[PDB]
Amino acid sequence: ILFKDDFNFFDEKVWTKETHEPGWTNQELQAYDAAHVSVGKDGDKSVLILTAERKGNKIYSGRINSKGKKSFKYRKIEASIKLPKTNGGLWPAFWMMGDNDKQWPACGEIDIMEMGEQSGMAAGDSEKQVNTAIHYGPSAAAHEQQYYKANVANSLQDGNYHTYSLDWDENNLTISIDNVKFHTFDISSNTYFHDNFYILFNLAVGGAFTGITDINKLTGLKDGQKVNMYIDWVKIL
Numbered sequence: 001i002l003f004k005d006d007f008n009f010f011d012e013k014v015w016t017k018e019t020h021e022p023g024w025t026n027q028e029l030q031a032y033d034a035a036h037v038s039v040g041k042d043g044d045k046s047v048l049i050l051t052a053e054r055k056g057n058k059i060y061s062g063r064i065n066s067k068g069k070k071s072f073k074y075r076k077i078e079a080s081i082k083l084p085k086t087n088g089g090l091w092p093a094f095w096m097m098g099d100n101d102k103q104w105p106a107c108g109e110i111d112i113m114e115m116g117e118q119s120g121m122a123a124g125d126s127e128k129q130v131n132t133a134i135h136y137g138p139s140a141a142a143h144e145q146q147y148y149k150a151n152v153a154n155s156l157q158d159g160n161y162h163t164y165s166l167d168w169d170e171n172n173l174t175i176s177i178d179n180v181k182f183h184t185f186d187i188s189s190n191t192y193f194h195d196n197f198y199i200l201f202n203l204a205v206g207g208a209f210t211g212i213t214d215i216n217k218l219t220g221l222k223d224g225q226k227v228n229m230y231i232d233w234v235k236i237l
Contacts, residue, residue, distance in 0.1 A: 002075055004235040007048040010039045014070045018063040018202075027213040028091070029059045029206035036062035042082070045161075048231040050203040052090065054221045062229075063202035071099035071196035072236055077112075078165040079201075080232040085157045086116040087126040088220025089212040091204035092229050094164050096197040105143050108192035109135040112175055113164040115156065116204075116220075117149070118211030127155040131209075132175045132183050136192035148183040161232050170194065203229045 005014060017034040024032075036051045050062035083092050093114040098107035111133040120129030133147035156162050156177070165176040173185040173193065187193040205221055206212045212220075221227065 002072070002236045003070065004233060005048075006046055006233050007039050007231065008046045010037070010048075014066055015064045016067065016069070018065065020063075022059065026204070026207040026209060028204045029089075029213070029215055029218065030061040030204060031059065032063045032202070033060055036060050037064055042230050042232075045230075045232050047082075048201070050092075050201060050229040050231075051226060052084075052203050052205050052221060052229075053226040054205075054218075054223050056223055057215055059205045059215075059218075059221060061203045061205055063200070065097075065200045066198040067097070067099060069198070071198040073194070073196045074168050074170065076165060076167045076237045077199070077234070078163055078237075079234040080161045080163050081113075082159070082161045082230040082232070083115065083157045084227040084229060085127065086220060087121060089116065089206045089210045089218045090220045090227065091116040091207055091210050093200070093202055093204070095200050096166075097200065098192070099196040099198045103139070105135045105137045106139065106192075108195070108197065109133075110166065110173060110193070110197060111135075112166050113177070114209070116210050118209070119149070121211070123151070125151045127157040128152050130156070130177065130182065134173065134185055134187070134190075134193065136190065146185055148185075150182070152177055152180070152182070154178075161230070168193075199234065201229075201231055203227075
């Protein structure tokens with residue numbers, strides 16, 4: 001093990017809590033702020049907790065990153081996550097971006113796991129449909145993306161923790177879910193996936209990915225509702 005966070009405490013030498021206004025990216029409805037990230041207990045487990053909540057028309061959630069603090073290259077990274085039911089507009093993700101100061105997408109982006117996509121709801125399989133992706137290119141105008149999506153065998157939003165893994169060498173990015181390979185991206189000649197990347201976790205609420213950008217359509221977070229996303233651990237081998 002190169003690095004492991006059991007989330008017994010919020011380690012500020014590794015993680016930063018983000019603050020952003022609603023609509024900052026992807027027409028998302030939540031504001032992010034520090035008060036919606038905490039560390040605590042889920043039974044016996046020490047966990048990082050991202051809390052999304054709605055107080056009328058104001059929605060708040062949590063997002064963290066390790067940019068400038070913890071990054072790596074060509075290692076396996078795995079996290080154990082417990083997810084809320086996403087149907088109706090929640091959008092959890094575990095992902096990475098290049099630990100440089102290039103503007104997106106030139107920093108490179110690897111989405112290990114995202115759920116809540118519009119098509120998962122339309123397919124009636126919102127608890128099983130996962131999207132994995134890479135984004136790259138020298139500017140927004142020349143944005144390139146590859147993705148894969150499919151339904152896993154068993155619900156990932158079932159009150160238990162699941163493991164999400166990325167294996168990474170100079171040729172491939174291979175995403176696995178509960179030890180089952182989900183997809184491999186060929187990066188052998190892709191110049192954007194060969195430098196250090198840092199880690200992110202977040203729980204977005206609405207946004208274009210979900211198909212829900214109007215709070216009147218947000219059935220997955222009702223007025224007065226709170227939901228949690230839990231990360232038991234993250235580790236880098």
